[PDB]
């Protein structure tokens, strides 16, 4: 059993900890090989119903025991897991699809359990959620949604506005938000004024005057909080550096540009911080998987270039003009990552992500529209100027003016310029024009037919499939942003308080504090009492029994099932009704032949 | 009050939201290419309310046909004979100014190309919810006219 | 309106409404569901009964048998 303990811990990926491999578990294990009796053993038997691939058995250990939404989460993604084992290691196919099979069919389970518990009640909806599974490793059934990439289960309106609950922090507030806490951002005696939440009303905790300070303090975590005061500080920082670009530097960085570097320093070793903060062991693991993001690449990438140009500015010149010219290619990267704080409004978000999606439809575009620029201007430029030295100004020349004439700027100075004549100047003086090239009246037909064929063709060709694409990407994207709130609500939970410009005495708090720690658990859980725990499976047995039979009730009273019962029994009664037909010729003779005797 | 064309105007103002929304990505797009531009094609500058105007002008109407082909890659650091034969010596070539023609390139193909068509994404697959809103508000507020 | 024409109005709605509820049940007794549902409840008790008419077959058939043999 230790050996499945290590293979549930593999194919359950991240800090997961099975009790099989906890030291009592081994312990009994090595003292004996009702304290051998498993406490919960449809648990058990779940897991080995579907580690040995047994769908049946696992759906009816499914029914049965209490914490389903948990098994069933756990299951999809146990059947995940083994699914990509089985495509890693060369296996059969087919098993891999009736793995993929059983993890979808496991994933609509808790997804319909999910419709019933929000159906009953919401409250407890949420408390089925949120409490911490002590034989799952002291997860939460969010967590374990997320871990199986189950983006139904996110969506749904109950994990929602779980997550919107999750996002207020401590505070009720929920009537025309941000505006609220920018005013409590900027003016601290506003926060007083704020309806805040009750001490034991929804208590997510990582880890298990006066009142003046409680509220400060539970207002300066709330994850909105600490998400509007990030974003006015790179908003701040995104001015200084327009300011620092535009106005002209001196030899040294003046106040603005000291600010700006300070900031770039300072989210350097934030980031820093959380590849050090991060679920592997391996260094090179914790650096791969925080590479996995592309923000992450794009922002180290930045920073290297943002600290390349300083270092570059830093010098005389001609180096100081070079930093400067890196200095603008970043300011153009910070500008394309205030999409990154779009991405929370609920409209800009999958609308940024429907971009991205319609990104790979303009590629292709940009694939058939450089084939056919390239055609047009390779013919124009060697028509056109037939003795020409090698130089690269030819490559130049290729793509400058057929790219410009897709935006409606024709070059109607140039498209066929009056040559092979005289014609007076303004001043009246006969002027005598060179002499025309050979086959120049090709240029402005081929001319034609380019712009005939991009303008008119291609682009009303890329409106087509962005047409025709849309519906399902708004859908996708819609779904995978509403998957992705809980990312950046978990995000700006387990970030400091500070933001990044201030970030550097949070820093050395948080130095300081592992320091003291060294010389003398990621998640949001709610750590519900005993008599809570028995209300919770209570409710979660009815929301099962409730969902089980009202499926039996819809299979009932279909049409399909009442047309086939009505078929089967008419057949039944056809037989039996000959069989009587039988019976009854039989009586008749019989009786005929008992009025003949008497 | 005409029965085609105030269901019309509600529906402009339906789509005036996506309008709004594409504003706003056009705007970020649109200051990145401007305040690009702006300071690397003019490092030595004073603080004025000029650079902000500079920031916003070509670029805008970058998006109406009219791309300022003067001024896209002007010949620079050389000698070029004026119009009357004069040996003309044009002025020293900005640091990086290659890079204004590329990212205008980059600008202009990710404004017009995508969010335009986009935009026009958007207006097409919520029509027939927001014409059919459009047409049924028209005959309610039918009453209150 | 007057008291003529406001007996009239509400004579005409009561009819409307006659009309509306009635033949929204016709519209209900009409339908394939309600049909196959009705259908399959009468087989069900029509299947039960001819059971209980099979068996009492059977004992007329042994009486008959009886008499036949007694006569
Ligand atoms: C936290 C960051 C990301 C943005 C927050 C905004 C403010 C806290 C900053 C942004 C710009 C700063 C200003 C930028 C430039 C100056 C000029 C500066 O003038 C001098 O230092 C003149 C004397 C000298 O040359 O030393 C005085 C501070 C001040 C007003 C700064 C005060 C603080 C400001 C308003
Ligand atoms: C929280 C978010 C939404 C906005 C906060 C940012 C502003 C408070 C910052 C961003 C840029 C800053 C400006 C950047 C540069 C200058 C020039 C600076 O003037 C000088 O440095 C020259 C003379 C001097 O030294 O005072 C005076 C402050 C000012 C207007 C700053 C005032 C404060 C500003 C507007
Ligand atoms: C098919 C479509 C979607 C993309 C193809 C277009 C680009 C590949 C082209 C269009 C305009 C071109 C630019 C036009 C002008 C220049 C300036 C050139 O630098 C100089 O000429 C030096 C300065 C000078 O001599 O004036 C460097 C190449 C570059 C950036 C070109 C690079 C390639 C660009 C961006
Ligand atoms: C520099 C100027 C002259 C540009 C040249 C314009 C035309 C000579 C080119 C540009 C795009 C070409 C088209 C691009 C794609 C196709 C599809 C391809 O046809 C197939 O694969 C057959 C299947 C089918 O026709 O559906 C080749 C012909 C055609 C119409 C090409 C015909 C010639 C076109 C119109
Ligand atoms: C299928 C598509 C992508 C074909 C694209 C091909 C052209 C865009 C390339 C291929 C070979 C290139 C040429 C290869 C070599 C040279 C020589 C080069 O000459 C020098 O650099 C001067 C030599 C010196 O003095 O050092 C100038 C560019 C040029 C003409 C290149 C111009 C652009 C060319 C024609
Ligand atoms: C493949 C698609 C999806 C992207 C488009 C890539 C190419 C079309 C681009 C990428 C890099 C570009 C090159 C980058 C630099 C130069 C040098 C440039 O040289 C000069 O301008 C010399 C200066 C002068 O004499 O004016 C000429 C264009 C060229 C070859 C560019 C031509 C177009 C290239 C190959
Ligand atoms: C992202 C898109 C949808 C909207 C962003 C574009 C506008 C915010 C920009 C585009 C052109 C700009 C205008 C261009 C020129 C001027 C003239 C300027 O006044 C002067 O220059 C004074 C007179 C003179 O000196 O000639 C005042 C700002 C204004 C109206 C600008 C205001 C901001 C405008 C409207
Ligand atoms: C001044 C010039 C250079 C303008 C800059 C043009 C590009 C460098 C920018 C403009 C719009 C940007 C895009 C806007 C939106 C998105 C979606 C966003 O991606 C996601 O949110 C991931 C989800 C998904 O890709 O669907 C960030 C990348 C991308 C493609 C951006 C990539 C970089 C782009 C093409
Ligand atoms: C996230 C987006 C919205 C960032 C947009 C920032 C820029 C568009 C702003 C922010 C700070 C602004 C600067 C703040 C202060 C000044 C000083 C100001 O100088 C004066 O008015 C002269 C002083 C005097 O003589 O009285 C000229 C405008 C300028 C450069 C502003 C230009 C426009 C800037 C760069
Ligand atoms: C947010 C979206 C939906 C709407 C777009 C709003 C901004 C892009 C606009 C609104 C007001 C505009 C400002 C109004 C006035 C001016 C002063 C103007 O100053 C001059 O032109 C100085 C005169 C000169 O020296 O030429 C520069 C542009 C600017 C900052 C404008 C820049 C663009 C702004 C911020």
Redesign the interface.
Known sequence: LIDIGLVIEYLMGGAYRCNYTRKRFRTLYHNLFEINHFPFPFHELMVWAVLMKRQKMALFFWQHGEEAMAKALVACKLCKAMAHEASENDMVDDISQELNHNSRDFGQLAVELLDQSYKQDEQLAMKLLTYELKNWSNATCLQLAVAAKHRDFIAHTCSQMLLTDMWMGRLRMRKNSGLKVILGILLPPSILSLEFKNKDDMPYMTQALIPLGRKIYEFYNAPIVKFWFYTLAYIGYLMLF?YI????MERWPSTQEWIVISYIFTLGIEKMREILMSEPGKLLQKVKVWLQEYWNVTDLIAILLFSVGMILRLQDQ?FR??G??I???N??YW??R??DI?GVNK??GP??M??GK??ID?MY??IIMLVVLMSFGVARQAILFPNEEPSWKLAKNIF?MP??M????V?ADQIDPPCGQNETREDGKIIQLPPCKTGAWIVPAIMACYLLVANILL?NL??AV??NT??EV?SISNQVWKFQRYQLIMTFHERPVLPPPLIIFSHMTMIFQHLCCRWRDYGLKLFITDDELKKVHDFEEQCIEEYFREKDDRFN?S?DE??R??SE??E??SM??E??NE??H??KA??Q??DI??
């Open positions: 327009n670009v535009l106005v002209k001609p003009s070079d400067r010219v200095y603008c290619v300011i153009i500008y394309i205030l999409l779009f409209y800009l609308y940024v429907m971009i319609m990104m303009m575009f940009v400058y790219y410009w897709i935006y409606g700027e070059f682009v890329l409106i962005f047409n849309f519906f708004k009273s049409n009442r047309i019962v009505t029994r008419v039944n009664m039996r009704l069989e009587v019976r009854e039989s009586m019989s009786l032949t008992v005797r008497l």
